[PDB]
Curated annotation (Swiss-Prot), chain B:
Record note on cofactor: Can also use Fe(2+), Cu(2+), Mn(2+), Zn(2+) and Ni(2+).
Native source species: Mycobacterium tuberculosis (strain ATCC 25618 / H37Rv)
Reaction(s) the record says it catalyses: tuberculosinyl diphosphate + adenosine + H(+) = 1-tuberculosinyladenosine + diphosphate; tuberculosinyl diphosphate + H2O = tuberculosinol + diphosphate; tuberculosinyl diphosphate + H2O = (13R)-edaxadiene + diphosphate; tuberculosinyl diphosphate + H2O = (13S)-edaxadiene + diphosphate
GO biological process, alphabetically ordered: diterpenoid biosynthetic process; tuberculosinol biosynthetic process
Name this polypeptide is given: Tuberculosinyl adenosine transferase
GO MF entries: (13S)-vitexifolin A synthase activity; phosphatase activity; transferase activity, transferring alkyl or aryl (other than methyl) groups
Sorted UniProt keywords: Transferase, Virulence
Catalytic temperature dependence: Optimum temperature is 45 degrees Celsius. No activity is detected above 50 degrees Celsius.
Cofactor or coenzyme needed: Mg(2+)
More about this protein: 1-TbAd is highly prevalent among patient-derived M.tuberculosis strains, where it is among the most abundant lipids produced.
UniProt EC number: 2.5.1.153
Length: 293, 291
């Protein structure tokens, strides 16, 4: 099955393929959107939060339409890369939109998305009226979308450093059960439901991943877009899916004892000089980091 | 300071720079060493475990000498990529070497390395006799290198999925202390000592990271070499270090509201021209990242 074929497939058979072979759980932060906003919109007229929210809908829609069961989307934390909002008041406007805007509520309905929140936000959100309201809206959104069974969407708010949460949870579970919680139960406790390990993380810019505790594995395929997340097109998404599905786990494994001198030379040249190439090494233009290619 | 300048530096300078600007903690699994072995050695005449061991010593020495304080190296687990051994009898040979080999005991001694092991190896490993022995060797090695204070080496053996371990550690801790353990205490519990969050991870081949629970962060800089880990030269390491130290956290941050139409255009065009690092191709059953 070739890449061009896969790009030529109608959406339905792609979603079938993904439902069979994964990725089942995908991590996708929306990074660099302030960059995107200053390049693709008019900051003098356009409303930042609405522009961003429209793109979040578009991308979530795209991911689910391609047959991805669960999306994990870090939204706000101390270690989020290229975050959507520098200051928490603006971030709280964004989160509120996530839990109250009619357009996105309609999206959750139309795509049967059940929406969960993870992280330390119940403690760490501002002890302000606004943060109280946001926490409330989160709880309400989890409730109002709880009849939706086709897709799971997990938003991460202070979704780094689960260690203390796991500890306290485990202590409680042991007190209430007489035995430690299994791994499964720990995951349910942190995310509100059981979620399988991530099959891919799609990042942007600097190679870095974050905010998906308990869900990371060496099997999680990692990608890093050159352009900020909201530049994501359906073709890009397909190149990533094709790579994860057919290329990252190609069979059969090569047998190097079976190789000709030529075959070893050919493979040696790829790895050997030239030279000492490492992906993730970059360069800086006008204060902006870009991976060298 | 530029890439060329940094590369021209005396090692001692590079190391002082690393000592004060980081990476203080670096994750470096040794991956694809079987490809390397089939490409660079003679399997009919060369001993695999010894060749691998010698390369491990070379790279570890290189990292510690460049000023890095703690190296975390996944050795064996269920989610390692391009692992050193397909079967656990061989992997136990390698582990045994790490705790018992003359050359490497000498390495720990001369570079004042304290060596710890993390993961669920005490439960999984000693199903057999060889495993039980490896575990005792692990313990002995942690103890006999314990007065070394310059550098820390953590070898990962079944060092993924710490959740259950953290849970039991916390239950026990709370039972003996009357309060939950802090993050620091949890980290000390899992690794034996407190370890700061990883500042960088250096993989190989398929973009993936693994086997450093509790120590991963958005700030962990990630790198994936094209060639198997044992091909690493001092130049590669210096390019990596330079990127992490001076590029990944460039200041000052750009101000888009202060750019000219032309400046906005040039940047808009880099992004509008669609590439994804991590997308690859396959030659002869082997995956390579596309440039
Ligand atoms: O301080 C910021 O919030 C910020 C960030 C950031 O995520 O920390 C970035 C960034 O993407 O890393 C940028 C940036 O686009 O480089 C800026 C910026 O406007 O230059 C800021 C910022 O608000 O200053
Ligand atoms: O789980 C695998 O994907 C797998 C497969 C496979 O294609 O299903 C094979 C195979 O092609 O037979 C093999 C194999 O080498 O026989 C392995 C394997 O290396 O054990 C795997 C696998 O990694 O699980
Ligand atoms: O089954 C293996 O152990 C294996 C692996 C592996 O780590 O799972 C790899 C690999 O690097 O992914 C390879 C490989 O080099 O691609 C091989 C191989 O010899 O092709 C094997 C293997 O022992 O078959």
């Amino acid at each position: 099955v070739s890449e061009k074929e896969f790009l030529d497939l109608p959406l339905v058979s792609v979603a079938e393929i993904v439902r069979c072979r994964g990725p089942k759980v995908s991590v996708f932060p929306f990074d660099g959107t302030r960059r995107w906003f200053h390049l693709e919109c008019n900051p003098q007229y356009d409303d930042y939060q609405q522009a961003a929210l429209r793109q979040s809908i578009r991308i979530l829609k795209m991911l689910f339409e391609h047959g991805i069961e669960t999306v994990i989307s870090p939204i706000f934390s101390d270690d989020l890369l290229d975050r959507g909002d520098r200051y928490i008041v603006q971030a709280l406007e964004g989160m509120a939109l996530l839990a109250n805007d009619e357009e996105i509520l309609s999206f959750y309905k139309e795509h049967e998305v059940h929406v969960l929140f993870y992280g330390d936000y119940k403690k760490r959100l501002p002890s302000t009226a606004q943060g109280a309201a946001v926490v409330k809206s989160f709880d309400d959104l989890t409730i109002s979308t709880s009849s939706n069974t086709e897709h799971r969407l997990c938003f991460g708010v202070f979704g780094n450093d689960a260690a203390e949460s796991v500890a306290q949870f485990s202590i409680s579970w042991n007190e209430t059960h007489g035995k430690p919680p299994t791994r499964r139960e720990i995951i349910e406790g942190y995310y509100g439901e059981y979620v399988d390990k991530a099959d891919m993380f799609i990042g942007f810019g600097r190679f870095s991943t974050f905010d998906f505790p308990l869900l990371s594995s060496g099997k999680t395929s990692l990608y890093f877009t050159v352009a900020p997340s909201y530049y994501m097109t359906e073709t890009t998404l397909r190149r990533i899916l094709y790579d994860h599905i057919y290329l990252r786990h190609f069979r059969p494994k090569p047998d190097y004892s079976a190789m000709s001198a030529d075959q070893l030379n050919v493979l040696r040249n790829r790895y050997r000089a030239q030279p000492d190439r490492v992906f993730g090494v970059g360069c800086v233009h006008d204060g902006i980091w870009f991976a060298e290619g």
